[PDB]
Design a protein around this ligand. Structure first.
Ligand SMILES: *[C@@H]1O[C@H](CO)[C@@H](O)[C@H](O)[C@H]1NC(C)=O
Ligand SMILES: *[C@@H]1O[C@H](CO)[C@@H](O)[C@H](O)[C@H]1NC(C)=O
Ligand SMILES: N[C@@H](Cn1oc(=O)[nH]c1=O)C(=O)O
Ligand SMILES: N[C@@H](Cn1oc(=O)[nH]c1=O)C(=O)O
Lengths: 765, 765
């Protein structure tokens, strides 16, 4: 059977330390674990052997009673550890009062399922699963190291700190890896992280499995460069050997967990491939007295550690002759000058092992003090040491560790801890070692960003797509990982609403700069000034001066017989209307306002009706004679026909400015002028024009005072064509106001030019 | 301690049957399992304690040797089963050759991890998890039921058959639920299904936990109406209890699994909450010879089974007076008239238990006949029965099952099997039953869709969003599962590229019907129909007729002195140009072509200019005299200017068809006409017109033949005004061709109608 390392005592506590390597894949069934381990094996085994013969020699802990030990090998396998635990409990079918729990979390679970039946407390130093924190299933399990929830949080913090978004995930099969990845996914995908794929692999899988895994990992190589390994000690080594085999030598940045840590045995011979990796290590200062005791050890003297001779032969490649464990495999013979001092590395968690073997001692001491305070030794009430009492005392245990910090188990049998984010760099030529960079204690991580990536060209960001926010572009996600987007550009009309929708602005509106929001488009009107309104207003002003001159001539020659042929008042109402129609242009081309446009409508309406109606009455009188003072009256009544019409139109169309939007980009303001509200007065004016066309066609060339009718007929004919010429523009355009102004102005200055100008032209003679 | 049913023999098989219920959450640590179970307990115990006395009686199976037993209760818990297994192996520290392992995945693995260390083959009848198919970790585990991969495939088939896409999932904590749900998730998310959320719950959790789980499940009533368990017996019952408590009676459709099967003890008293649910049950015909043995049992005589009296007093809520197990909790007593024939239901896994026991017996028989073929009994070669040999013999066993089929173990340790879909329907009022509605065997699925939902208003398909492949509204996904999409339209000119993106068509193009594709929109041209161009062509034809009449008169009355004041040809060329006007109109309104382009340009550039040059020469000769044949040459030199300038513009701009895009919806075909390419000939025409105006008023009214000077000046004035009247429309419009046609026509019929016509007006007398 297997060998065991006894040491005598009054109270015996067990331990399970992974002295030998994991059994190979092909010999799992035989359960014959392979090579020996130094750090995880002989160092730990020696620690107990010492940290009990310190406790025994110390009078202040457990006086007059001697803790012994039975240290037994678990080969880091759940099957072997279970058989060893069975060997532990064979006595209960001297009793074992407790064990120092095996390193692996899955192995810890397997051994706990058996130990809790016989009420045997178990203390772990490296088991770091969340699954072991549930006291319903694991009542008799306590740890001196924090859970790996905090470790997953630390890894997530590291990932989020360096913009890393698109990462790959690898985890060892078991409880450690499974729980690690579960926590990592749950608490990462929430915040910002985005896992490309997750792969699982056994520690003892063949090289073929690792090759396949590396191919699958390289499948996403261009984008996902960070691999987040909640993996174990040997899984990462397998990955490194696969990397060496496949020729890939630094396209990945492995992001380890507390299986890689500070360990040198996982990067021996493959330092070129793992350079740049970030690991997370439970903090524990190196003990000193253990080194002093350990370095002086020799294979000749240490008989109490049955694995010592084999390890001694394995480390320095030679053989021992004068001892049974010759192991003739090694050729040369060891000389009496070899020592462990050279290339001596004391692993992490050597603080934790001693802290455990203490916590157990302090629990025993407290329960001894409580049960029989008077006696000093094994009292009658202690001979069958009760598991329940021991666990009750152990739950509330509280002391100072070797590191100087204090140890307390909370309600979950757990102890708090701080992480230390190591980094694998290359100091000199062919010289690699782990460099402490950061830390993480209770959600706060201090990181030396300078030490990692001693430059500004850090590792390529593990992102699926570049930041898509340069302007109008707006990301669309194609069903796959929510962190792969395309850069589809929205249109100029819309602005980015969120980041996945862009929404159109109002009918009169435009997106602001940088597409941040939307704001009202500036309004445009016919400003006072401008090219064309000057050409309008100068025409209007010169027309006003001309008509003032004409009325001055009229009033001067008030009683002249050559002009006292027609009704003088009739030849007045014309010019008054002309003047009003002239000021109509001025009140038309102006800043749109409530007070202005109704007056503008009145101007465009009445003047070219009343003046032309006076002309109609004059032509009526002439044609009928070829009456009395009633004609001035009929004029007034004829005018009014229109005043009533326009006042009626004023009701359904009150003067109020509305904004016009011919296109999405420009906005104009005009009042309630409408096609129906303009055509009707223009229609009436047109009807009057057609009525007076008949009388024009009647008069032809009648010999009158200075041949007035001959000029007025031609004038009215010209006005007809000028009026009908401008309709296509006015129907469809944005120049309605200026066109109306021009049309009115040009319709005027023509009738006066032929009805009054020749009279004034010859009035000088 | 815990009682253990014995039966003496030579070779003792063990077994673990869940006689008692799972220990409550509060008393897990005490390990006191609660109430007794009939189906999963006493029925199975009675089965084994018979089959192994039928086998003993049978001479053809294991002759001259008597199989025994040692049934123990696992209480459906990992902890209790482990201690029972320890009790099994205590002898090996009579030996137990093997066990009929517990039917529970987690319990199976827990017992296996202990048994394989002692080479004890274990056969499970109800452990269907996938994890137990690995022979690297579970070399000593065989089962007579198929794995859960097939069951997950069956559930996925059922889900996909009824269009169910947005589903919710709950699985019992443990190896069975976890593995089953992992397989279901993979195999569903691969194909087309879409899980809203996944919940995990322990089967023995309090009512508060189930209430919280049901709240989380009701968080998605509107869409996720199907919840697909893969959960255990006493987890669907928890769901039903929560449904009863918070008053849901059909808001969900539970889709059960092998755990639910058709068990009547998971819906007793909660039928109203579970109506309509679909379950999956391993097919096993009811064994008949077992019923005859079972129904005749009496508590007075049956003293092999130690649990039988307790079960008897539990089933009939009474107490037995004459035996120590009085259990005075019950009030009334039991008369000698109770019989198990009332409401007798046989569990749906009684085939598999007997099959497993037969398998173990046949394996033992094979190994017996191989090791010592001659001797009939237990030869000396098997006093220490080796577990390895027994496992080797078991792995290749092959016999006929109780149901009728054959039992064989493949290389993976499991056995083939077929499933049976079932539906829990309310047949009569206050009467419910499980109805077989199909089956599932090796991939192919048959379902009687008529029996389930005997209507068309079935359970609403659980979809997060309506299928939005309608019209042109596209699909956008929003950071949640690629099944909860909001449907948005895109622009009318845009056609759908794929299900998620739409893009606009070309500058000149339009999306086809149903927005599937894009096609070239037909071009729009100056159609020969329509009222306006028909009127234009009629006017051009009338102009041609007028010119032909004029030339007929012109020639008839050529040499006559009344018209022989000016050069007939000076007049003729004018006539040639006026005809060329109408020819230009004809060549303008047509299909725009390469030839027609330059022809139309030549016409418009030449005709009016060459006519007006002759006109100005004719006017200026008379004006200056108020000569000879030099007038024709001095006019031709002016005519050459248009030819030169048009040739220059021809060199600058070649004639070609140009396709214009006024809007995204309208496309026209026009020529390469340019503003600068037409303004210059217009400029020359204009300066010629103003020169003619200058020459006009000089002559004013001159007495000539029919007083030509009287009319021609007025005619040209009319031409000038009509020319400048039409230009605003041509400046802004889309009807350039027809506007130019009208302009040319109007400029025509005036140079003749009152300049040539008066000459011939009195030519007939
Ligand atoms: C990205 O990382 C850099 C430092 O590596 C720093 O700007 C910050 O942590 C991140 N920036 C953004 C915009 O997320
Ligand atoms: C939905 O299921 C029905 C059968 O129940 C069948 O038409 C097809 O599988 C699905 N129909 C559509 C339109 O996808
Ligand atoms: N921490 C791991 C165990 N472990 O694996 C290694 O390779 N080192 C180490 O400590 C766990 O909690 O399971
Ligand atoms: N089939 C389950 C076990 N099981 O759970 C129940 O509630 N019934 C039942 O058979 C498994 O394979 O784990």
């Amino acid at each position: 059977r297997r060998v065991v390392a006894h040491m005598p005592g009054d109270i015996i506590i067990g331990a399970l330390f992974s002295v030998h390597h994991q059994p190979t894949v092909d010999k799992v069934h035989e359960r014959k674990c392979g090579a020996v381990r130094e750090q995880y094996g002989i160092q730990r085994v020696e620690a107990m052997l010492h940290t009990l013969e310190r406790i025994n020699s110390d009078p202040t802990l457990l006086p007059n009673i001697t803790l012994g030990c039975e240290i037994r090998d678990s080969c880091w396998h759940s099957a072997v550890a279970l058989e060893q635990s069975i060997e532990f409990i064979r006595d209960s079918l001297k009793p074992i009062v407790g064990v120092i729990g095996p390193g692996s979390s899955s192995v810890a679970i397997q051994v706990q399922n058996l130990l809790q039946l016989f009420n045997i407390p178990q203390i772990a130093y490296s088991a770091t699963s969340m699954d072991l924190s549930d006291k319903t299933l694991f009542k008799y399990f306590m740890r001196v190291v924090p859970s790996d929830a905090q470790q997953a949080r630390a890894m997530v913090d590291i990932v989020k700190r360096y913009n890393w978004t698109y990462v790959s995930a690898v985890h060892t099969e078991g409880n450690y890896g499974e729980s690690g990845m579960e926590a990592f996914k749950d608490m990462s995908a929430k915040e910002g992280i985005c896992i490309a794929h997750s792969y699982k692999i056994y520690s003892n899988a063949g090289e073929q499995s690792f090759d396949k895994l590396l191919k699958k990992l390289t499948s996403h190589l261009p984008k996902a460069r960070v691999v987040a390994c909640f993996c174990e000690g040997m899984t990462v080594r397998g990955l490194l050997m696969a990397m060496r085999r496949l020729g890939l030598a630094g396209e990945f940045l492995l992001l380890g967990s507390d299986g890689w840590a500070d360990r040198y045995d996982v990067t021996d011979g493959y330092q070129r491939e793992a350079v740049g990796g970030i690991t997370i290590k439970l903090q524990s200062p190196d003990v000193k007295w253990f080194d002093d005791y350990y370095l002086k050890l020799r294979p000749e003297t240490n008989l109490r550690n049955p694995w010592f001779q084999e390890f001694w032969q394995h480390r320095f490649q030679c053989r021992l002759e004068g001892f049974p464990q010759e192991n003739s495999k090694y050729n040369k013979t060891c000389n009496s000058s070899l020592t462990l001092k050279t290339h001596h590395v004391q692993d992490s968690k050597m603080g934790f092992v001693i802290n455990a073997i203490y916590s157990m001692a302090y629990g025993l001491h407290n329960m001894q003090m409580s049960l029989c305070p008077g006696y000093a030794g094994l009292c009658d009430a202690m001979k069958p040491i009760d598991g329940r009492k021991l666990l009750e005392s152990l739950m509330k245990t509280n002391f100072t560790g070797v590191s100087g910090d204090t140890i307390l188990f909370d309600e979950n049998g757990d102890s708090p801890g701080r992480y230390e984010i190591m980094n694998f760099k290359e100091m000199g030529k062919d010289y690699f070692d782990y460099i402490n960079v950061g830390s993480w204690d209770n959600g706060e991580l201090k990181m030396d960003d300078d030490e990692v990536w001693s430059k500004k060209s850090n590792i390529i960001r593990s992102v699926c797509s570049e930041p898509c926010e340069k302007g109008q572009i707006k990301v669309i996600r194609k069903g796959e990982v929510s962190c792969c987007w395309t850069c589809t550009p929205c249109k100029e009309n819309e602005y980015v609403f969120d980041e996945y929708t862009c929404k159109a602005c109002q009918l009169g509106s435009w997106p602001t700069d940088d597409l941040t929001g939307c704001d009202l488009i500036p309004v445009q009107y016919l400003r006072w000034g401008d090219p064309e309104p000057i050409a309008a207003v100068v025409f209007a002003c010169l027309g006003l001066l001309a008509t003032l001159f004409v009325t001055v001539v009229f009033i001067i020659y008030r009683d002249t017989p050559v002009v006292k042929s027609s009704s003088r008042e009739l030849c007045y109402i014309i010019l008054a209307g002309i003047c009003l129609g002239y000021l109509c242009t001025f009140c038309l081309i102006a800043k749109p306002k409530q007070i202005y446009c109704y007056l503008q409508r009145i101007g465009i309406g009445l003047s070219p009706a009343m003046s032309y109606s006076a002309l109609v009455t004059k032509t009526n009188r002439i044609a009928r004679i070829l009456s009395a003072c009633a004609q001035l009256v009929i004029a007034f009544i004829l005018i009014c026909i229109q005043l009533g019409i326009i006042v009626a139109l004023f009701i359904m169309e009150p003067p109020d400015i509305m904004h016009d939007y011919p296109s999405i980009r420009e906005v104009y303001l005009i009042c309630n002028t409408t096609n129906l509200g303009v055509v009707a007065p223009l229609g009436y004016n047109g009807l009057l024009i057609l009525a007076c066309t008949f009388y024009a066609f009647k008069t032809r060339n009648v010999p009158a005072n200075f041949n007035e009718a001959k000029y007025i007929a031609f004038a009215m004919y010209t006005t007809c064509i000028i009026a009908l010429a401008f309709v296509p523009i006015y129907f469809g355009s944005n120049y309605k106001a200026i066109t109306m102004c021009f049309s009115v102005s040009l319709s005027a200055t023509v009738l006066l030019g032929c009805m009054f100008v020749p009279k004034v032209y010859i009035i000088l003679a």
